[PDB]
Design a protein around this nucleic acid. Structure first.
Lengths: 71, 178, 136, 132, 24, 16, 91, 123
RNA sequence: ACCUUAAGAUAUCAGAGGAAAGUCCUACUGAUCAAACAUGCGCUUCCAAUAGUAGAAGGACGUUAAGCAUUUAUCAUUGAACUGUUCAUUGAAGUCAUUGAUGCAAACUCCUUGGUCACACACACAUACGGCGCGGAAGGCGUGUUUGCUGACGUUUCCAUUCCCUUGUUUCAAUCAUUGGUUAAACUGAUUUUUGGGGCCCUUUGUUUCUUCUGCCUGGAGAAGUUUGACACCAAAUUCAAAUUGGUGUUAGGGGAGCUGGGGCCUUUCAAAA
């Protein structure tokens, strides 16, 4: 329908809180109309253990997607 | 089909930037400014007062208030009250828009001036300023103007006083300043 | 830091915060009354606020915001509970209050103008520069 | 059993039960009955409406006596001590001072209590027809 | 028309008491 | 075109 | 819908919105979409237990928003009036 | 207050509602628009029962007195997903006759202004 | 420079008719439903002292107030004494608060809101209480008419098509005029002009707030105007004002005559049944 306005967050480090407790930081690579996001070089902030080279996050469990860069 | 309610122009159905283009132009940027000026102007101009419930005064309450005196009512003509209302509204607007910035002029030569008062190189709201004035750069050092008093600055502006009470001022100053 | 000569900005912040948050509107009077007596650099702005805010009063009972009922009845000879015709009486109360404010303004203007004429007009530097600086 | 007579009472309350509850609240602050609403008042046809001897009220919507209302008590001595409760300081319900005086004749309920403490009953109901 | 005006005053005619530079 | 599921179909079907 | 259009009209002004997790956010509203996705700028966040921090931007999914507090002046918006006149749209 | 039996959410415009959420928080403000049933409230103040005083509501002085923390927040749009149920509390400021009067007033003014706008924009 | 569209429908069943089986339609006909508008119910609840200085409802994001009672203020590493305790060092985070938070309770001050209406200062009531003054607010129920969601816009070779007083009010008297009733000489009632008196109101605060202009407290007044129009105000830039373009509003309250929609009650006339 309407693609979310994330064309300015491309290839910039962001930190988004999975569900209500987890917080994942990575480099955004793409997104879908459901607000699914694929972010590379993830790191589960808590010491903090990396996730993998390429992860996808279902847009249902995303709450906020604040960006840790110039934007 | 969605139209702007300020411009009143009927816009072919859009949802993307087409609505971010219309709302970011000038016929929808200042024509939405004139609208809310008028609506806020009204709520300033409103003079309707609360409903008045008048109770029948009793004898004990009437006799004392009738004893004292009658009080004269001051009244103006139509043109005079027109002029007075215009003056009062203008004075209210002028005072409401007034902002005091003496502290900004006082610290004009501070060692860390360009990083705080310039308001474009600040760290909190500088991210907004960072197609469209001799701006003060952040790279200024205190070596520039080692001695501020070398005729560079000017005297502090004298304090303002109310004009309607301008005859209240003392006639002569204590000392003779040239 | 309230009694600073250049303390207009702090009092402006305090007044805007009170006017934005408080809803009873008695603290505004209780703070502007104190501001009226401090010899600030910009006492004129606060006196104009006081004059306009006293000029927009609309009924006898709101004069109790200013001072106490006994004080109004005894010093200014103004009766808040005066029932009858209240238009001219409220105008009389406004005139008396404006005269009192004019006398307050006379005192404060004398103080501020004396200070500025004698001392504050000669001072050019108000900031700490460096240990290597020389002051005149 | 003697009924008291009350003047200068408000006529706004409209409803009889609401008026009784409001007057009872003003008579007895923190009362067991007035403070808790939705309580059915004890209708003593021939049980205390309120403690300290308050038995029943008797109001009328007739335009002849609007503000007037009557309080009927359980015992005369209780009624007399109610006068000492007034002690000539003007009792106030809502905003208007009320004047209080003993009624010229006790209420029908008080008459019933006096009669039990049945010819008087039949005579009273027979008197109702002739005056109507 | 603005309600705030700069104050103006008359000079005290420069005798020996009102001179700010007087040192004797 | 209704819920985004149809649009995602008209992407996944081409992807396969 | 009217509320979505009101949130659209509320662009460029400081709004405060509380999520379903308990957090609170306030700041300039850059962009909003028809599905209640909002982008706040210079936001001052209050995590549920009371701590307050600051970030440059944020993009919160609209499915988590509880309510959004816009400036009070928007009560006089032209799209809140019921009887409206239309310019007779062309062919 | 009494409200008409045949009164949907469209009739309760400028009524001062009592909107309840899933998390035990109520909102008390004037309804001015709706849609998914996500309302717009004018001056709604949010109330809640603190966990320290929740225990007094449990079945057992005679009359309970609960201090409810309330926050003031204005012209807020809710989301229909969280809304649980709505109750009515107070009538609008204006009577029904005056409401009809102002509606007729604004309709007359709008018709005249539209006629003048057409007359100006054509010639 | 980006954008040019989800598709359908507008009460419902039953009966008669028209274009074997549906199919559609009927300024057709019943019944139900819904909406609007009139109109009623002995319907139900609510509408503030002045015979007084009050009170009711709701607030305070108000004060006393540091009130009275409880309870809170990091984690890891290393050294030292110590029978867990104390002192120092490195690293890691860390909402502000401790005059806070939480529990309890009271006084005080102040805001908004209302018919602060009329007649009364009254001996009622068992079938318990004339609910038998005028309004207003909110619902419940019933009837009638129209409609079948509702509104602008165009066309008609469609219909339509009004006046008057008034803007403190009320009351008494003097007087003028008009009109009716009885004996145009007398009396009586209704309308009006001028002057005076009494009461209440003027916060109408930009001194009547429908607009402009003249104007006012020893007064309540004068002139012009009333919707394809006028008036008030806002914003700009030409480098003051004026100019224009773009906007937001205001054009009211009461009474009367005609004309007209509805109810109740009465009369007459007509039709059906008893």
């Amino acid at each position: 329908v309407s693609t979310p306005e994330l064309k300015k967050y491309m290839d910039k480090k962001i930190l988004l809180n999975i569900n209500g407790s987890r917080k994942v930081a990575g480099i955004l690579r793409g997104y879908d109309i459901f607000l699914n996001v694929v972010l590379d070089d993830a790191m589960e902030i808590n010491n903090n253990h990396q996730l993998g080279l390429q992860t996808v996050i279902r847009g249902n469990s995303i709450i906020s997607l604040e960006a840790l860069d110039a934007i | 089909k969605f139209y702007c309610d300020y411009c009143d122009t009927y816009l072919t159905h859009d949802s993307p930037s087409v609505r971010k283009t219309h709302c970011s132009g000038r016929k929808h940027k200042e024509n939405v400014k004139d609208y809310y000026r008028n609506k806020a102007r009204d709520i300033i101009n409103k003079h309707n007062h609360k409903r008045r419930h008048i109770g029948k005064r009793g004898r004990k309450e009437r006799e004392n208030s009738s004893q004292n005196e009658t009080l004269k009512v001051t009244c103006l003509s139509n043109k005079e009250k027109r002029h007075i209302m215009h003056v009062k509204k203008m004075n209210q607007k002028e005072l409401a828009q007034t902002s005091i910035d003496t502290l900004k002029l006082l610290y004009d030569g501070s060692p860390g001036y360009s990083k705080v008062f310039v308001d474009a190189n600040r760290f909190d709201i500088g991210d907004l300023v960072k197609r469209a004035q001799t701006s003060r750069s952040r790279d200024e050092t205190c070596e520039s103007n080692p001695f501020p008093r070398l005729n560079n600055p000017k005297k502090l502006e004298p304090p303002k006083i109310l004009s309607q009470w301008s005859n209240t001022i003392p006639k002569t100053s204590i000392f003779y300043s040239v | 830091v309230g009694l600073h000569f250049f303390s207009g900005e702090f009092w402006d912040l305090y007044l805007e915060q009170i006017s934005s948050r408080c809803t009873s509107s008695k603290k505004y009077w209780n703070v502007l009354r104190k501001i009226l007596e401090i010899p600030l650099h910009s006492f004129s702005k606060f006196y104009a606020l006081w004059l306009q805010r006293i000029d927009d009063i609309m009924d006898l009972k709101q004069l109790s915001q200013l001072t106490s009922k006994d004080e109004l009845l005894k010093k200014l000879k103004i009766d808040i509970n005066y029932s009858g015709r209240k238009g001219p009486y409220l105008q009389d109360a406004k005139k008396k209050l404006k005269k009192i404010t004019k006398e307050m303004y006379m005192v404060v203007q004398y103080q501020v103008l004396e200070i500025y004429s004698i001392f504050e007009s000669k001072i050019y530097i108000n900031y700490y520069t460096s240990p290597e600086t020389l002051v005149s | 059993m003697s009924a008291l007579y009350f003047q200068n009472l408000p006529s706004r309350p409209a409803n009889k039960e609401n008026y009784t509850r409001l007057l009872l609240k003003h008579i007895n602050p923190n009362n067991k009955y007035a403070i808790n609403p939705s309580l059915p008042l004890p209708h003593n046809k021939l049980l205390l409406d309120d403690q300290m001897g308050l038995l029943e009220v008797s109001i009328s919507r007739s335009s002849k006596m609007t503000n007037q209302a009557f309080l009927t008590f359980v015992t005369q001595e209780e009624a007399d001590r109610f006068l000492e409760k007034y002690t000539t300081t003007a009792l106030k319900v809502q905003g208007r001072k009320v004047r209080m005086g003993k009624a010229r004749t006790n209420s029908l309920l008080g008459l019933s209590i006096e009669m039990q403490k049945y010819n008087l009953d039949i005579k009273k109901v027979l008197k109702a027809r002739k005056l109507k | 028309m603005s309600q705030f005006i700069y104050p103006v005053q008359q000079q005290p005619s420069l005798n020996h008491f009102t001179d700010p530079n007087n040192t004797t | 075109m209704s819920t985004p599921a149809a649009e995602q179909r008209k992407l996944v079907e081409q992807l396969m | 819908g009217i509320p979505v259009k009101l949130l659209n009209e509320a662009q460029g002004h400081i709004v405060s919105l509380e999520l379903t997790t308990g957090a609170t956010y306030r700041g300039k509203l850059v962009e909003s979409e028809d599905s209640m996705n909002v982008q706040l700028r210079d936001v001052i966040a209050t995590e549920p237990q009371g701590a307050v921090t600051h970030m440059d931007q944020i993009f919160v999914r609209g499915s988590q928003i509880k309510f959004i507090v816009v400036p009070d002046l928007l009560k006089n918006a032209p799209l809140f009036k019921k009887n409206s006149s239309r310019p007779m749209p062309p062919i | 207050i009494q409200v008409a039996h045949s009164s949907r959410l469209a009739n309760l415009i400028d009524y001062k509602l009592r909107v309840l959420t899933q998390d035990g928080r109520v909102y008390i403000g004037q309804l001015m628009a709706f849609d998914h049933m996500n309302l717009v409230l004018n001056e709604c103040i949010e109330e809640r029962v603190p966990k320290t005083q929740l225990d007094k509501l449990r079945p057992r002085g005679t009359t309970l007195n609960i201090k409810v923390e309330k926050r003031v927040l204005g012209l807020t749009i809710l989301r229909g997903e969280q809304i649980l149920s709505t109750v009515v509390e107070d009538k609008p400021l204006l009577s029904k006759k005056e409401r009809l009067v102002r509606d007729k007033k604004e309709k007359k003014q709008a018709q005249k202004q539209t006629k003048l706008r057409k007359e100006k924009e054509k010639k």
